[PDB]
Symmetry: C3
Subunit: 421 residues, 3 copies
């Protein structure tokens, strides 16, 4: 049996008091992780090559995930069964080297490690024909699925509270990779077409986006004994809310009191990213990110996000280093034009199983400092019924109350382990 | 560590719209599975032979099951801890080859694969002395347990709503197998005696069945490089509701509003089954079922069910085939004499790790078509309190409303993987 | 992958009727286990040495626990993710042989097997520097965490119902072990300092204990081919309620109707224990316990507990024995001076993978008999709001009602397996 997975777990303290707190900018879709993770998260994978005959094999893979608060020993939880799929390679003679798979699977996900941000992730139940040799590159075809909690009406209503039926969304993905646009550089190109798939006779709210597109172009350049990826993505309508390849075409959300509300996503998103990891000399490693994300919605409630951070690692020994992370976020409300921003600085002393900034397990002892100034927040007071500004960007002091995190500081510290195996 | 289990997972679509739907006849205790399974189900077993000295060993086995809807990637769930037992073989000198076991265990279950129907399954917490050589055959002894959600009263009441205490049921099983009644044929004989086991001073509703019997006779005949099993079972009272070897002697059920209601099972059941799998030549494999099940209750709410289906497999290659399944159901209401019936036809193109119809993993790409006509359904409208016909068979149009699935059609299609390892 | 764990599972019956019942004295913090365990409990550990270079290694360990009632086969549950940690040995040159760990971990827990009582257990999320060679012994340093369900107020209130915020408690542990005070005898010394760690601006109820100490001294003496441990512990205030090394400094509890109530623990605890396991000859093994525990609270609601039991094992064969357990409990109410007492006697026939009383797997077939006489119980009638004596020791017949288990008997019997691997 092959045993694989991912896990992080630790203990932490907040400078001003209590358990460790973590810091993410309001409106930002991520935070800089080092010394800024507040849960024990673990994926336990048990797979196995179950049959092989020459070139041909069938591989079976599973994945059970756990997320607990790490405030006690006995912490009961609901594990998520995330993967259960079978991959058959070289089963099709006419398309050599290609794999046919079916089942629940984490499919070719692209992410930026230091911000734990996935930018191209259509995982879920699915099926596909993978790595077909097109000569100049490899072509992959996949269909995966997701579903919104409500959004469909059994009959025609004008009342949004009637659209409570779960709505399936399908994604049809096509990728063409490993094309050497240049020396030390490859180009991947993807097209995602997602759409809400209604049961016979159901209906979506009038004006719901229904479908959309995600277009991706990723260029990888081998550099400084590392790499640099430069990404450009553009989404349309139903693909703009999740923004990673999954569709949300009903445009309906629910308050905690089960009230439906209209979160319509007609609009577009433009993401331009550049991240990588480079070694410089023998004593230095560094990962870096720079991103600009603009979600422009018809309804005016989008955001324009900018991030940058770097994570230099200095190796004292082949197994001991000092890692440092500095991250900066700035998010502007499409609705109000206000701006939330933050900068985090973490300093850690670590021990890792390797000499790379990618080496795991790592055991860290850190101190983090964050200072923010948020001038807007989302209005989640009231009910989708009470509140009519429910879920909308609103200034920090709107109507005497207060939104966003304010303008303060905080420092935390602790020890943590992270590992993938 | 030995890693074993079962898992199926896929993606599907309904002809008329939305996620894949599955089709089972109202009153039928099963459906024909091919291209008719709508969940990701998986059992992950980790066991190990923990001690061995010569002929003697102790084996430890566990089983954790997961069932998710397969509509999203992150699907939190409550796994079922189904097995945790220790089997000690050859530990008793005077009864060589026999095993003593204790713990939660899937014990010698008999099922019909294509309809995923278990007809002899007394699994659960238990203990036993297994495979004792009686000379002409092997004798097995086991005691297992189950419990109904309510059914017991702490005191005497005339009000069914008072019988809300969980009621333990015990099964005492004796089997005598591997007797060669003939050439290429064996005979197994079993006797199950189940009974509700009340706490000191509790009582069951007046007239509750309390106990019952299940008698099984299974004949296996080696044929056409395969087998054919012919089964005949007869149950009495408390064993008729579950109908697989477990007892439900309280005769009390609960509506979703926590209302107790009387589901009394005094009566009997007669099951006559014949299934098998035969290879015919080199290019053909086929499994088949034919069953007649009559649950005749004193309360008149039983059913008389008839099924038949076949699943021919034609091998193009040793790893690629075309499988087809055709199934037919017909259930008649004991209470109303009406009839529900259905026929399903599925066509699949598969790739399996082997040349058998029993070879797994299998990766299928299918299309299913079902056409039904249901003339009765169960009344689950109202409350066990509001409704007094609650849970009873009622005609399709009863009192202007509508019961059963109607008279329609539907086709689905998709890809799926199934595997046992 | 290393597969390890613990599991017990069985089937049982109560003499007077129904599923097996188990017997523990009111006020006692444990029961004598043999033939007195009523659940299927299992810990499945999957770990692995992930990197090794010479003397240095990184080990990764996990632990997922399950507890089900064992009354049915399908029993859905919420597993507890109890361990996910990484241990790095010999990573620090100046402190050879020492381990640095971080993550959730069962840390050096001390327990008495026959009563399944842990007396020194600070496990949970944590981090530490383990086994530092101090020359005359090994020094260990650890910081772990726990948190109470409520206990903190966002603002100052005089109303206990306002203290509903979860309150983190930190433990700082220092141990010095393996000192040979004598021949065949070692001495371990520990100091635990626990404290409630409030968020900036939160407050604890007026008079809440806040912090406390646990002092441990354990002497192990190699004897009769076995050992004998003699323990003496003394706790103060916040460490007296849990009494194993974890802190509960808020002093606030909640009724099932979510009502806060004051369970203040200022006071002290004195525990004096002696347990061991000795072999006597070739045909006899025996474990034994004797303990006196005095929890003296300022609020007068403590207890003075005395236990003693022995578990002789007589080996007929190297794999078959007859085990017997006799246990006695006596608990006196600090508040009322009344006394609850019980004696249990179990007789079992077992088969184990080994000739020791510590050999597992063990498959038992037993009969247990318990006879008790309880003259007090805790008042949990009403609400923390209705009842003002809620949670207090009260005589058996207090105000006409009845508290405690009474004065009766009962016998049970069944089969069970227990195993650690
Ligand atoms: O497995 C390789 C990747 O491991 C991590 O990815 C984790 C991520 O950190 C965690 O927060 C997420 O929930 O699960 C994935 C594992 O599936 C790193 O973050 C990635 O950079 C690595 O490539
Ligand atoms: O998918 C990778 C991410 O997995 C986790 O995130 C979970 C989260 O823990 C869960 O509560 C939420 O409902 O779903 C997400 C996955 O969609 C990890 O926490 C992250 O580190 C990973 O990025
Ligand atoms: O493990 C051998 C059997 O595998 C399957 O049995 C599954 C069944 O398909 C699934 O629906 C049920 O819930 O669990 C069992 C595994 O315990 C096949 O259906 C059987 O025909 C095989 O003999
Ligand atoms: O026991 C074999 C069957 O196991 C599963 O069925 C579960 C079902 O998933 C669960 O929701 C229900 O409560 O219990 C049954 C088992 O009693 C599989 O779904 C089936 O394929 C198997 O036949
Ligand atoms: O693993 C060695 C110890 O196994 C058991 O400890 C169990 C205990 O029995 C169980 O009730 C508890 O919940 O979990 C632990 C396993 O972590 C024995 O009780 C101990 O005496 C053994 O040393
Ligand atoms: O920690 C060892 C003990 O683990 C279990 O006890 C659990 C119990 O099952 C769970 O319901 C409760 O909430 O937490 C405790 C652990 O704190 C075993 O049941 C025991 O045998 C062990 O002593
Ligand atoms: Mg749950």
């Amino acid at each position: 049996v092959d045993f694989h997975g991912y896990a992080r777990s630790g203990i932490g303290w907040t400078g001003s008091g209590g358990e460790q707190q973590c810091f993410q900018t309001t409106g930002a879709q991520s935070k800089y992780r080092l010394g800024n993770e507040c849960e024990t998260y673990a994926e336990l994978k048990l797979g196995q090559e179950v049959w092989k005959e020459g070139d041909k094999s069938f591989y079976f893979d599973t994945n059970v995930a756990y997320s607990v608060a790490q405030q006690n020993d006995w912490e009961a939880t609901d594990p998520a069964f995330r993967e259960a799929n079978v991959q058959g390679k070289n089963l099709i003679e006419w398309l050599p080297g290609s794999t046919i798979w079916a089942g629940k699977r984490f499919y070719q996900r692209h992410d930026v490690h230091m911000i734990d941000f996935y930018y191209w992730d259509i995982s879920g139940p699915g099926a596909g024909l993978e790595n077909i040799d097109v000569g100049f590159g490899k072509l992959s075809l996949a269909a995966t699925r997701s579903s919104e909690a409500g959004g469909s009406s059994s009959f025609a209503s004008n009342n949004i509270y009637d659209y409570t039926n779960e709505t399936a969304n399908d994604v049809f993905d096509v990728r063409l990779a490993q094309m050497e646009i240049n020396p030390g550089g490859t180009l991947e190109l993807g097209v995602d077409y997602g759409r809400a798939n209604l049961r016979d006779n159901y209906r979506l709210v009038d004006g719901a986006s229904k479908d959309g597109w995600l277009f991706t172009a990723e260029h990888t350049q081998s550099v400084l004994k590392g790499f640099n990826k430069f990404v450009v993505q553009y989404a349309t309508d139903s693909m703009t809310s999740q923004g990673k390849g999954l569709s949300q075409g009903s445009g309906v959300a629910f308050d905690n009191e089960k009230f439906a509300y209209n979160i319509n996503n007609n609009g577009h998103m433009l993401r331009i990213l550049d991240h990588g990891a480079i070694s410089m000399g023998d004593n230095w490693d560094m990962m870096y990110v720079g991103m600009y994300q603009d979600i422009n919605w018809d309804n005016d409630n989008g955001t324009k996000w900018w991030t940058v951070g770097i994570r230099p690692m200095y190796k004292w020994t082949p197994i001991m280093s000092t890692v440092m992370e500095i991250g900066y976020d700035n998010v502007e409300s499409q609705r109000t034009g206000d701006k939330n921003n933050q900068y985090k600085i973490t300093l850690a002393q670590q021990w890792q199983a390797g000499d790379s900034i990618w080496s795991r397990p790592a055991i860290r002892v850190f101190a983090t400092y964050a200072k923010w100034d948020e001038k807007w927040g989302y209005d989640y007071t009231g009910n989708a019924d009470n509140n009519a500004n429910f879920g909308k960007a609103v200034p920090a002091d709107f109507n005497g109350g207060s939104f966003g995190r304010g303008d303060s500081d905080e420092w935390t510290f602790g020890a943590q382990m992270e590992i993938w195996w």
